[PDB]
Design an enzyme around this catalytic site. Structure first.
Site, PDB file in Angstrom:
ATOM      1  N   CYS A   1      22.310  47.823  58.792  1.00  0.00           N
ATOM      2  CA  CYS A   1      22.964  48.792  59.654  1.00  0.00           C
ATOM      3  C   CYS A   1      24.476  48.666  59.506  1.00  0.00           C
ATOM      4  O   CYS A   1      25.001  47.629  59.094  1.00  0.00           O
ATOM      5  CB  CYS A   1      22.552  48.597  61.113  1.00  0.00           C
ATOM      6  SG  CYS A   1      22.955  46.977  61.805  1.00  0.00           S
TER       7      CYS A   1
ATOM      8  N   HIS B   1      26.443  36.111  59.595  1.00  0.00           N
ATOM      9  CA  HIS B   1      26.710  37.519  59.297  1.00  0.00           C
ATOM     10  C   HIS B   1      28.170  37.703  58.916  1.00  0.00           C
ATOM     11  O   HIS B   1      28.984  38.178  59.718  1.00  0.00           O
ATOM     12  CB  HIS B   1      26.345  38.404  60.494  1.00  0.00           C
ATOM     13  CG  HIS B   1      26.304  39.870  60.185  1.00  0.00           C
ATOM     14  ND1 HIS B   1      26.867  40.413  59.051  1.00  0.00           N
ATOM     15  CD2 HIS B   1      25.769  40.907  60.871  1.00  0.00           C
ATOM     16  CE1 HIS B   1      26.678  41.721  59.050  1.00  0.00           C
ATOM     17  NE2 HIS B   1      26.016  42.047  60.144  1.00  0.00           N
TER      18      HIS B   1
ATOM     19  N   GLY C   1      28.330  49.704  61.348  1.00  0.00           N
ATOM     20  CA  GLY C   1      29.045  50.179  62.517  1.00  0.00           C
ATOM     21  C   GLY C   1      29.580  51.584  62.318  1.00  0.00           C
ATOM     22  O   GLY C   1      29.894  52.008  61.204  1.00  0.00           O
TER      23      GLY C   1
ATOM     24  N   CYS D   1      29.614  46.672  57.568  1.00  0.00           N
ATOM     25  CA  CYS D   1      28.547  45.726  57.290  1.00  0.00           C
ATOM     26  C   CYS D   1      27.700  46.019  55.998  1.00  0.00           C
ATOM     27  O   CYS D   1      26.931  45.126  55.553  1.00  0.00           O
ATOM     28  CB  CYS D   1      27.587  45.641  58.453  1.00  0.00           C
ATOM     29  SG  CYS D   1      28.391  44.963  59.894  1.00  0.00           S
TER      30      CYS D   1
HETATM   31  C1  COA Z   1      27.982  37.032  70.536  1.00  0.00           C
HETATM   32  C2  COA Z   1      29.427  36.534  70.450  1.00  0.00           C
HETATM   33  C3  COA Z   1      30.283  37.377  71.394  1.00  0.00           C
HETATM   34  C4  COA Z   1      29.487  35.063  70.877  1.00  0.00           C
HETATM   35  O1  COA Z   1      30.847  34.690  71.107  1.00  0.00           O
HETATM   36  P1  COA Z   1      30.999  33.085  70.957  1.00  0.00           P
HETATM   37  O2  COA Z   1      32.019  32.624  71.926  1.00  0.00           O
HETATM   38  O3  COA Z   1      31.495  32.725  69.450  1.00  0.00           O
HETATM   39  O4  COA Z   1      29.601  32.354  71.310  1.00  0.00           O
HETATM   40  P2  COA Z   1      29.588  30.784  70.918  1.00  0.00           P
HETATM   41  O5  COA Z   1      28.622  30.601  69.811  1.00  0.00           O
HETATM   42  O6  COA Z   1      31.048  30.256  70.426  1.00  0.00           O
HETATM   43  O7  COA Z   1      29.134  29.886  72.182  1.00  0.00           O
HETATM   44  C5  COA Z   1      27.990  30.473  72.778  1.00  0.00           C
HETATM   45  C6  COA Z   1      27.287  29.474  73.697  1.00  0.00           C
HETATM   46  O8  COA Z   1      25.878  29.644  73.603  1.00  0.00           O
HETATM   47  C7  COA Z   1      25.264  28.526  72.893  1.00  0.00           C
HETATM   48  N1  COA Z   1      24.308  29.027  71.890  1.00  0.00           N
HETATM   49  C8  COA Z   1      24.648  29.919  70.909  1.00  0.00           C
HETATM   50  N2  COA Z   1      23.629  30.179  70.163  1.00  0.00           N
HETATM   51  C9  COA Z   1      22.575  29.473  70.611  1.00  0.00           C
HETATM   52  C10 COA Z   1      21.275  29.408  70.157  1.00  0.00           C
HETATM   53  N3  COA Z   1      20.944  30.168  69.070  1.00  0.00           N
HETATM   54  N4  COA Z   1      20.422  28.614  70.799  1.00  0.00           N
HETATM   55  C11 COA Z   1      20.829  27.902  71.854  1.00  0.00           C
HETATM   56  N5  COA Z   1      22.072  27.940  72.318  1.00  0.00           N
HETATM   57  C12 COA Z   1      22.983  28.716  71.725  1.00  0.00           C
HETATM   58  C13 COA Z   1      26.484  27.842  72.180  1.00  0.00           C
HETATM   59  O9  COA Z   1      26.307  26.455  71.843  1.00  0.00           O
HETATM   60  C14 COA Z   1      27.573  28.020  73.265  1.00  0.00           C
HETATM   61  O10 COA Z   1      27.368  27.108  74.353  1.00  0.00           O
HETATM   62  P3  COA Z   1      28.750  26.342  74.692  1.00  0.00           P
HETATM   63  O11 COA Z   1      29.813  27.322  75.000  1.00  0.00           O
HETATM   64  O12 COA Z   1      28.481  25.415  75.999  1.00  0.00           O
HETATM   65  O13 COA Z   1      29.211  25.431  73.429  1.00  0.00           O
HETATM   66  C15 COA Z   1      29.934  36.630  69.002  1.00  0.00           C
HETATM   67  O14 COA Z   1      29.088  35.831  68.172  1.00  0.00           O
HETATM   68  C16 COA Z   1      29.966  38.041  68.459  1.00  0.00           C
HETATM   69  O15 COA Z   1      30.940  38.740  68.651  1.00  0.00           O
HETATM   70  N6  COA Z   1      28.943  38.530  67.730  1.00  0.00           N
HETATM   71  C17 COA Z   1      29.002  39.898  67.208  1.00  0.00           C
HETATM   72  C18 COA Z   1      28.290  39.990  65.860  1.00  0.00           C
HETATM   73  C19 COA Z   1      28.553  41.315  65.202  1.00  0.00           C
HETATM   74  O16 COA Z   1      29.084  42.208  65.825  1.00  0.00           O
HETATM   75  N7  COA Z   1      28.205  41.513  63.918  1.00  0.00           N
HETATM   76  C20 COA Z   1      28.468  42.806  63.279  1.00  0.00           C
HETATM   77  C21 COA Z   1      27.147  43.506  62.956  1.00  0.00           C
HETATM   78  S1  COA Z   1      27.141  45.152  63.718  1.00  0.00           S
END
Ligand code: COA
Ligand code: COA
Ligand code: COA
Ligand code: COA
Lengths: 387, 389, 390, 387
Positions: free
Chosen positions: C376, C346, C378, C87
């Site tokens: 930060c 991100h 990983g 990152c």
């Molecule tokens: C968190 C994570 C597991 C989510 O997986 P995801 O399946 O893509 O989550 P999604 O966004 O596709 O869907 C999430 C649900 O919550 C809802 N939602 C997401 N964000 C929202 C928000 N900010 N406000 C309201 N609702 C929200 C979405 O609409 C969805 O609802 P649905 O399934 O009925 O359409 C994924 O984003 C992830 O792996 N993040 C890691 C980031 C990371 O590691 N970065 C590296 C830095 S160390």
């Protein structure tokens, strides 16, 4: 409506990733198809239909039975199709070809089975797309051939159920396997398999395969007991007392008794009766028990009337339960060994033991015979043969 | 031995990756197996064997026909197995089930076909290992279902050979397709598919969806949009996505028994099987398969072509269908009165029983006495069956 | 030697499988490379080296940084290479490009990062062969980008570790996330992202599409819908898809040169790189990386935390971002004034340069003299850089 | 700021799918990291940063350089990162680690490279989904390591372009390859690789401490019988080209004052380095402008060089490099080259630095030069002076 087996042939049973490691199943099948026509003096142009059992056809192309028929020399006028009743495919296809002639819809049928478990590919459904995360590449041989679709465990676990319910110890199953190896090893040296086996040329230098490579020399009871269980951490089914993964093909030439008489052919036997019954999937190895009874009842025979018996040895546990329940003389059951030593090509096993049953009956003058196998999912198939 | 069709049923034909995009074939089969038992008043415990044609079973598990029978309620004592004669599997399985009762080895047979080409996976042989270089993940639907194993090209190329050999222009094939779409659109609005179609419940997680209508039926198929399509198999060819059948999912089956059995149970069958036949042809022109198969089936039944009241000839391609109607010379007004596979869809394993369902219910709906169903098969084969009410 | 940032540019941050679903990362990189040259009046023939951070390059070809440079017009005489510090790759690449000029081995550097997480393929080792049984097709994005190689769980679990030690409730993390969305939505409506964003033309099949706005910013993020979401990494956890950054695509870069070189060309730089630092921490709580990295950067620059006028701290997770602001204790009103990665997105390989772009253009618009960007990393690391205006 | 190389180490170069067939790259890296620490008397807790070049890290996990550092004993307070400049990655990482100390941002650096080409997986983008048709599983080693992204052909094709422009015949390339094998085989028998190589334990455990690609008794006749590997009527074969290999190499960097305070006798002083790009069509000519720029930055003439290590990616590119610069070939690759030793992409840059450093101390050479060609049309060179 008298249907006879004019001729029969089979390839040598190859080991998993062995001599037939890169040979498609239809390559073994046409060699057998050409053999049964040559051994009976019948030209390929007289075949009406080819019926080949096959369980693992993924990746081989459109209708591998048609490819085997077209490559063996059967003209395009004939038809071809495949069927799948797992391990009973090779034997059910023979009964199906018998029904084609019995109903007057065909005159000459080439029926049997072919299987290339080494060529079975890995697969995965990818049309919807994998948005995120890992997915599994599934082995089609294990999933579509060796795994029960209702309980999720291997066929070897169903054999454990048979061993536990019938109270078959580890020593009793191992002694049955060693007996199968000793009978099969003796039969190969004595040349009792030479008539039924048709040599296959693996065009690579070219290599001719005419001997079952699964026969291991000097199978000892001590080496059998040292193996670890393959399906239960504290189980009884091992690699020694269970059939293996193999490739091969086998078939037979079917026609009416009047047709064989007109051509001067001396058939191997007449199909007098057949039967297929289903059982509980937990104990799929008990399938041959109700199927053999239904076949003998349809033929008008008693269990004591049988002169030779070929019961497929999918597992040592399932084979012991079949011979004890029906109570037939074990000295006439698998006289030349079984699938534990010869091999177990799923699609071709039904026709494989039919070849061994037919040629051994003529070799020793047996009058009545019976072939039967167990089928995954809880089924059995049996056929009565009379010389 | 007189064998009758006591009842028949089929699911709605779904589009490629459509309503049945994630439904296994045996789930569609189990619904049809339960339907033919309920429509004939026959309990599951009396079924002796289930015969389901299927071309693409890779990844579905051990013997999907056994899975469909066990899930539909057929007891474990009965048997089940699958067979594969490509496109004619669904109809050949009915003829195979008829032979089981004729030879006295069974009393009640459920025969038909099921196919879920959307669930068809990609595969590759990886046991030897790929030491170096790229390898191909093969689409099992294309390889084992739509590609000729002797010449390597698609079934659409065999239709190009038929069109060139029979001298069928692009306009003649498009006009046949437009007629097929319009007949299917009229039949759907008039409810002529409601009797044969059994609703299927797509058990999901965000709500269940009931499917009871063929979703491939296009409303208002125009000849202009038909002429705007590009050829799909030859850069300068004549077969397009419009004048060719599509990729679809579905299942269909029928309940077979002797005519005496139906009389003992008070069952009124849909028809008696009078004859069937299967003949092979050159794989280059596999679309001409139904021509000698229909001749042998009619010859075995003792009927002439003029005796037929209704005809069901599967429309694999508009070129192959025009050559069949031109050769046999039967009245086109009695051929596919409610449309064909160009508009309804072509599930390979289930198409044979699908057009038999349309033939049986249409013969009953209009009082036709003699009927014929026929299909072409890849690799150069044909299958036909003559039905009498 | 004094090294300045002559110009900077970034693409819009695309959603996972969104506008950039089928655009390779080097295509986004080439667009940014051309932008920083045009914004500074420097021709491509004058660039000595291109340094692009990238974490997921599997399947893109030989050295995607070289492909981005060749397509942007950089001649073959120049060099290009990629680096991977997860990152912090986008920001470390800027520090690395600064060192090329500091040691006198280069004159003009284009440094930044690019990432196409949508294009990350599935893989499996198949040379030995699978004799029997099923094998796993591994998602390279999850395995090589989001999974800790020492403990086996996701980066979101490390955020759970931070939340437990700092005692950060679900309500505090949701309130931090909603605040991040509202700041980003306000900045987008006010056009505060227009200067840093260079439009990208998605060359498609049925017509070209121009992307010039971050598509992850959702309008009208409510606290109620945020609190109804289920935890995404622990069945009884606190980190959800709403209070965590998402999977995104994008690229960002900057043009580096000495302060004397910019003076000879009449260029007014965006800022002077005064110090940088990178420190490692425990992989269990990798989100605390910016705490020792920012302190080490300020110590090298001779600054105190109170001297900072603007702070850009990457919001990988709401738990890690709240713990960073509490430890360092800087005024939160100057930290991520235009929102953070929870709302903007991100893209791992390009996030370091992405927040550097937001820091630089915000410093010029409000006249801030001292700034700091930090992220930060990983595996238990952090990176920070101090910027001073001219 | 004068930066020296306090110590250096490398594993034996393994053959493709050989001794390191199932060993991840970071396992080879940790062994080298521990070796350079023990050989210099510097504890792991004193390392500030680890910089490892790696070109094929797909499937190994998050930042393999960090994994190599954590397992070798480097504490969590230090940092680690990977970089990718293809074949010059291993040597450029040393130049990058040298710059960390020059700018005062670090005191002790472990820099080098690691590569496990056997562990490189096959991949395919499957998120969008394959609605219909076949797709290719792409070999990441070929695609991301050995294929030019601008013209689409292999690195061996670029060597064919080099052979045509400099007019290097098949016999001249074969004679160069055989000479490389003979020099490497002689150095191995005399033990000239023993100092630089650290034994690796492939956990029965197997210890690997000898380059397994070196074939004993390489003949010119068998070399001329080989078929061209990249052009059906070409000149580059498997014999006159480097192979696919696994291995790791690194060095310990610190200031000359720091080494003096610790009583360390360094292997050499880094005096200059350079990297220049060329046309991707003839990427093998990269070392020509890079070595000139390194010598110009060091203030040296080509005649001042006492020892030269020029990586032998291909016999054609290596002959063209020796002819253009014109240095004495008797001082170039005295102990053999990558044609005989092997060519691990990520680790080759540091591998030839190890061979240059231990040979300079063995014969008392004062000035040395290491250089490699880089895919995509680049070169990298570094000048070393003994102290
Ligand atoms: C968190 C994570 C597991 C989510 O997986 P995801 O399946 O893509 O989550 P999604 O966004 O596709 O869907 C999430 C649900 O919550 C809802 N939602 C997401 N964000 C929202 C928000 N900010 N406000 C309201 N609702 C929200 C979405 O609409 C969805 O609802 P649905 O399934 O009925 O359409 C994924 O984003 C992830 O792996 N993040 C890691 C980031 C990371 O590691 N970065 C590296 C830095 S160390
Ligand atoms: C054995 C089986 C269970 C898989 O285990 P496997 O690893 O493929 O068996 P292998 O042959 O590869 O290895 C077995 C070992 O036992 C040894 N062994 C096997 N049979 C032996 C025998 N009869 N005597 C002595 N030693 C024997 C083998 O040499 C081998 O040695 P190893 O320990 O060094 O590996 C496989 O045969 C199987 O799946 N059978 C199922 C068949 C089936 O279900 N058919 C369906 C019809 S119901
Ligand atoms: C012909 C075939 C290749 C179609 O490929 P396809 O592109 O996936 O078909 P699609 O309908 O999804 O796409 C066709 C396009 O033409 C349009 N189209 C198709 N049929 C149309 C029609 N009848 N009227 C108007 N428009 C039509 C579609 O909407 C689509 O629009 P697009 O141009 O934006 O893509 C495939 O269906 C096929 O191979 N069929 C034969 C399979 C077979 O062998 N069956 C058994 C016979 S042996
Ligand atoms: C050239 C290359 C394809 C090797 O061909 P290969 O597919 O691996 O085939 P092999 O390496 O197993 O060798 C092939 C044959 O030549 C023979 N052979 C190899 N080297 C030989 C030698 N030095 N002397 C005599 N015979 C030799 C082998 O024994 C083998 O015989 P076989 O086929 O009967 O087993 C591969 O090593 C390569 O791509 N190298 C290029 C690496 C590269 O470009 N790196 C980047 C640099 S910028």
């Amino acid at each position: 409506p008298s249907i006879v087996i004019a001729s029969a042939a089979r390839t040598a049973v190859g080991s998993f990733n062995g001599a037939f490691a890169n040979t498609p199943a239809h390559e073994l099948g046409a060699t057998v198809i050409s053999a049964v026509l040559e051994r009976a003096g019948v030209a390929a142009g007289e075949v009406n239909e080819v019926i080949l059992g096959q369980v693992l056809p993924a990746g081989e192309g459109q209708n591998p039975a048609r490819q085997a028929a077209m490559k063996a020399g059967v003209p395009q006028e004939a038809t071809a199709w495949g069927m799948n009743q797992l391990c009973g495919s090779g034997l059910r296809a023979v009964a199906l070809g018998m029904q084609q002639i019995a109903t007057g819809d065909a005159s000459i049928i080439v029926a049997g089975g072919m299987e290339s478990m080494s060529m079975a590919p890995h697969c995965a459904h990818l049309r919807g797309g994998v948005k995120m995360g890992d997915f599994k590449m599934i082995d089609t041989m294990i999933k579509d051939g060796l795994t029960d679709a209702f309980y999720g465990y291997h066929m070897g676990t169903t054999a454990e159920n048979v061993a536990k319910q019938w109270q078959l110890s580890r020593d009793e199953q191992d002694a049955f396997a060693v007996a199968s190896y000793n009978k099969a090893e003796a039969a190969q040296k004595d040349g009792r398999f030479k008539d039924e086996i048709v040599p296959f040329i693996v065009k690579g230098g070219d290599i001719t395969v005419d001997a079952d490579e699964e026969i291991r020399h000097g199978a000892t009871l001590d080496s059998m007991a040292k193996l670890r269980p393959a399906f239960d951490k504290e189980g009884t089914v091992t690699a020694g007392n269970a059939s293996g993964l193999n490739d091969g093909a086998a078939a037979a030439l079917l026609m009416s008794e009047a047709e064989a008489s007109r051509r001067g052919i001396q058939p191997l036997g007449r199909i007098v009766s057949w039967a297929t019954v289903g059982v509980d999937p937990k104990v799929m190895g008990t399938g041959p028990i109700p199927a053999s009874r239904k076949a003998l009842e349809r033929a008008g025979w008693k269990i004591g009337d049988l002169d030779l018996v070929e019961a497929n040895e999918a597992f040592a546990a399932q084979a012991c339960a079949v011979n004890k329940d029906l109570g037939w003389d074990p000295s006439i059951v698998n006289v030349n060994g079984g699938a534990i030593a010869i091999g177990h090509p799923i699609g071709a096993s039904g026709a494989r033991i039919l070849n061994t049953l037919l040629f051994e009956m003529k070799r020793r003058g047996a009058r009545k015979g019976l072939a039967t196998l167990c089928i995954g999912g809880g089924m059995g198939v049996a056929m009565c043969i009379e010389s």
